[PDB]
Symmetry: C2
Subunit: 146 residues, 2 copies
Amino acid sequence: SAYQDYLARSRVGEGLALAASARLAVAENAASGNGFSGGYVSPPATRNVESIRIDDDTGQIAIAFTARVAAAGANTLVLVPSVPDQADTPTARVALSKGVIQAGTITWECFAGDKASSSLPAPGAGPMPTDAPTLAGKLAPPECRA
Amino acid sequence: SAYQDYLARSRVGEGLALAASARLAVAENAASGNGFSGGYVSPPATRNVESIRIDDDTGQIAIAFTARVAAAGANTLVLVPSVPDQADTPTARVALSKGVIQAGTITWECFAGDKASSSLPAPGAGPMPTDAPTLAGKLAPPECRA
Ligand SMILES: [Br-]
Ligand SMILES: [Br-]
Ligand SMILES: [Br-]
Ligand SMILES: [Br-]
Ligand SMILES: [Br-]
Ligand SMILES: [Br-]
Ligand SMILES: [Br-]
Ligand SMILES: [Br-]
Ligand SMILES: [Br-]
Ligand SMILES: [Br-]
Ligand SMILES: [Br-]
Ligand SMILES: [Br-]
Ligand SMILES: [Br-]
């Protein structure tokens, strides 16, 4: 229902905002050439957010929501980071490189379970999720959907 | 109450996680010589966090918590950013300077209302909050306390 969608979308937006902590940790680790999850301590679990985790190799962030939001196995949204292939007039986006000092701006793309391709402006597509998200797109902000 | 203080501290941890988006914005603006609040917007208000605001001239972040955490007027934490005067041969910490291209590591210090002074390692004290924080330190993580 539209009302049920409202409850879920509001709670999913809160989870995305709580994941700013992970986006910062990934940026700090990228700036030092460290594994992307190194030193990251996620905020306390809430009634809506079960966990926020970082993939140490790619910097992908996975947000798992509680049953108040979505059923288990259909409850995970992912954010994928990328950087331009070169800072000045890039021709493409690339995944982060573990171990490399990368201090430029990271672009984060949100993927819900229905989103089958990257949709970003120039310089174009970013990487796809490492671990597939499972949250229904209708419960996530529009930038996460197919 | 010990339990209530523990619950409050957990909710303050949520607000500190939300405030990572402001810390990222300050760092991006410092690297570009822009006003420190440029292009940032307080994440959605939550049951625990009223607002997160950046001072455009200093980069200090004010986090205001709801009554679920502390009473109105006793509910704010301030995060203060600083950099060394010289990254390679430092003698002191200094406040951020709007308009300077600052690409080094920014150190953030958290202040509760009853934290009397900056307490950072060498090269020494960072700046104090421009306006007084009001959250009691017992409701905040230890790094915010006297
Ligand atoms: Br939440
Ligand atoms: Br993690
Ligand atoms: Br970034
Ligand atoms: Br698609
Ligand atoms: Br471009
Ligand atoms: Br929405
Ligand atoms: Br919150
Ligand atoms: Br962010
Ligand atoms: Br602001
Ligand atoms: Br209080
Ligand atoms: Br230093
Ligand atoms: Br008190
Ligand atoms: Br704590």
